[PDB]
C-alpha cells in the first residue's frame, strides 16, 4: 500500500498534481518517518519535501493529508536542531498554529505536538513559536470547565508542549508569555493524570529556574502547597520535577523559602534524604543546603523537623555528589546558625562523618568541610569548650587529616588547615 516506498516514489507522488496521489505519497513518507530504526529524516529533507508537507497543512478540504504531513513534519522536527530548523524554514510554524483550530482533534493534537518539538529545540525557536501567536490557540484548547472531559493523550500532549514553551534559558521565556500560561499551568498542576502532573511540574521547575522575580511569579500563583503535595507522591516521575521546583524556589529569597517550609515541605525530607534514587537524594540535599543557608528561624525548623540526623546520615553514607551537597548544607548551617543550633549539630554526630570526608580528593569539598569546622570551633569558643571539640576531632582521626591537609596543593586549603592547627591543637 503505502508501506516501504522509496523516497524517489514519494517525491513522484507528491510532485504529481493529484491530491489523492499526494495523500498516498505523504502517508508513505509518514510511514518511513515513523519507523523507530533510523527514520530517513535527512533523505526526506534533501528530497525537498518539507515545503510540500507544509503546504499540505493548509489543505482544509483534505484533513487526511493535513494529518499525514503534520505527522511527517512532527518527526522531522523531532530530530536535530538542523532538522527542526528545516521544518521551521519551510514555514511550518504559522501553518501548525493555524492547524490548532482544526475541528479534527487528532489533527489539532498533531499540530500541538509539532509545535512542542519546534519550541523544544531551544529558546530561539520557542520564542519564535510564541511570536507567531501559538499561546492563545494552545490555551484555548484547554479553556474547558473540567480538564477531565478532554482526551487523555490530547491533554498530555498539550501539557507537554506548554511545558516546552516554559523551558530553556538565555533567555528565559518572555515574561508576558509566562504570565499568560501560568493559570492554565496551575490548572494542569492540579489534574489527576500522572503524566500531566509530571509535565506541569517540569514546566513549573523551568519557570522557577531563574531570578527571584521569576520565582515570585510562580510562588504568587499559590502553587507551593500543590508542589509539596506532589513532592510526597509515590511516582518518581512526579517527585522528581516537584523536588526540582521546590529546590529552585528555595534558591530565592528567605520569604520564598518560608512558603516552602510553611507548606509543609520539610516533613517530606526524611523520605527524600533517604530516597533510593541517587538524584532525588542529591537534589533533596541540595535543597536542604539552600534552606540551611536561610534565617536562624528556618534552620530551627530544619532542626525541629528532625532533619539534622538525616544530614548526618547523608554525610555518613551517600553518593559522593550527595555528600558534597551535605557538606554544603552543614557549612551553610554552621555559617548562619546560633551557637545552640551548632551545638545541636555536634550532638547529632556531625563531626566524625565530616572528618571522614576530609580524605576526599575533591578540593572544593575540603574547603567546605574546613570552613564548617572553623564555624563549629567559633561556636565552641563562645562556650569555652574549644578543646573538647579538639579531642572529638582527635579521637576520630580528624586531626590527622587536618595535619595532612597542610601538605595539600591548594593554597586556601593548606592555609585554612594550618590555621585550624594553630588555634586549637597547640
Amino acid at each position: 500500500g503505502t508501506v516501504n516506498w522509496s523516497v524517489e516514489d514519494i517525491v513522484k507522488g507528491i510532485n504529481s498534481n493529484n491530491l489523492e496521489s499526494q495523500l498516498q505519497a505523504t502517508q508513505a513518507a509518514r510511514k518511513l518517518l515513523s519507523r523507530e530504526k533510523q527514520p530517513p529524516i535527512d533523505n526526506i529533507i534533501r528530497a525537498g519535501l518539507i515545503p510540500k508537507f507544509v503546504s499540505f497543512l493548509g489543505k482544509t478540504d483534505c484533513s487526511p493529508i493535513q494529518f499525514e504531513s503534520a505527522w511527517a513534519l512532527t518527526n522531522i522536527a523531532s530530530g536535530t536542531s538542523e532538522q527542526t530548523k528545516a521544518v521551521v524554514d519551510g514555514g511550518a510554524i504559522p501553518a501548525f498554529i493555524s492547524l490548532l483550530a482544526s475541528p479534527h482533534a487528532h489533527i489539532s493534537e498533531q499540530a500541538v505536538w509539532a509545535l512542542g518539538n519546534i519550541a523544544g529545540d531551544g529558546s530561539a525557536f520557542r520564542d519564535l513559536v510564541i511570536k507567531h501567536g501559538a499561546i492563545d490557540p494552545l490555551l484555548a484548547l484547554l479553556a474547558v470547565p473540567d480538564l477531565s472531559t478532554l482526551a487523555c493523550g490530547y491533554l498530555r500532549n498539550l501539557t507537554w508542549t506548554l511545558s516546552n514553551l516554559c523551558r530553556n534559558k538565555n533567555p528565559a521565556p518572555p515574561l508576558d508569555a509566562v504570565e499568560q500560561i501560568l493559570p492554565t499551568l496551575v490548572r494542569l498542576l492540579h489534574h489527576n493524570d500522572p503524566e500531566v502532573l509530571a509535565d506541569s511540574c517540569w514546566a513549573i521547575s523551568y519557570l522557577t529556574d531563574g531570578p527571584n522575580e521569576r520565582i515570585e511569579m510562580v510562588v504568587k500563583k499559590g502553587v507551593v502547597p500543590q508542589l509539596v503535595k506532589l513532592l510526597g507522591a509515590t511516582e518518581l516521575p512526579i517527585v522528581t520535577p516537584a523536588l526540582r521546583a521546590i529546590g529552585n524556589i528555595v534558591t530565592g529569597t528567605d520569604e520564598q523559602t518560608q512558603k516552602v517550609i510553611d507548606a509543609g515541605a520539610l516533613a517530606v525530607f526524611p523520605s527524600l534524604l533517604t530516597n533510593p534514587k541517587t538524584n532525588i537524594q542529591k537534589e533533596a540535599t541540595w535543597t536542604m543546603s539552600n534552606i540551611t543557608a536561610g534565617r536562624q528561624d528556618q534552620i530551627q525548623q530544619v532542626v525541629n523537623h528532625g532533619l539534622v540526623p538525616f544530614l548526618v546520615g547523608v554525610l555518613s553514607k551517600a553518593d559522593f555528589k550527595t555528600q558534597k551537597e551535605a557538606a554544603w548544607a552543614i557549612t551553610n548551617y554552621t555559617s548562619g546558625g546560633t551557637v545552640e543550633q551548632i551545638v545541636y549539630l555536634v550532638h547529632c554526630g556531625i563531626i566524625e562523618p565530616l572528618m571522614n570526608l576530609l580524605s576526599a580528593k575533591d578540593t572544593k569539598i575540603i574547603q567546605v568541610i574546613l570552613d564548617a569546622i572553623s564555624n563549629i570551633f567559633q561556636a565552641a569558643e563562645k562556650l569555652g569548650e574549644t578543646e573538647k571539640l579538639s579531642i572529638m576531632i582527635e579521637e576520630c582521626g580528624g586531626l590527622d587529616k587536618i595535619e595532612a591537609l597542610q601538605r595539600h596543593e591548594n593554597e586556601s586549603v593548606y592555609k585554612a588547615s594550618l590555621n585550624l592547627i594553630e588555634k586549637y591543637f597547640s
Partner: peptide
C-alpha cells in the same frame, strides 16, 4: 529529563 522532542511512532 524530560524529552525536549518527541518522535511519533504510531497511532
Amino acid at each position: 529529563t524530560p524529552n525536549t522532542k518527541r518522535f511519533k511512532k504510531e497511532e
